[PDB]
Amino acid sequence: MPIVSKYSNERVEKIIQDLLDVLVKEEVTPDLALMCLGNAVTNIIAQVPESKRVAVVDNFTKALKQSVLEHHHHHH
């Protein structure tokens, strides 16, 4: 329900950017990016206790679909 503000947003978006930098440094393809990122995500989720391990990945995948569909929400 509430989006936790545990960390500085600047830092959050910066890390996102630095990750994108890696992807643009190699000029990776969409397929490649998804495959590399997917393994990175899974690695982190494996470090999360099993009790919530299935929950965190599901919420991840759920929210992922939410953000993708909101790109043409009220734009052309």
Next chain:
Amino acid sequence: MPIVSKYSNERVEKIIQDLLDVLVKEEVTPDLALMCLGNAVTNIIAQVPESKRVAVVDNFTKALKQSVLEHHHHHH
């Protein structure tokens, strides 16, 4: 196109490695990692045509939950 993969698995792993190096040098938490990676993936899927955008994100998310449940032990 005469492409079955194009990119070498060696490079694929190396990219994942570098992505990990990014996350490690930032000392990211599970919360932060998923939050940053989610936006990164979303931007990648935003480069994918809407004609297949829902397909790629669904297979991505599908493969994620597969990997999470599959990867308890290494594999071999």
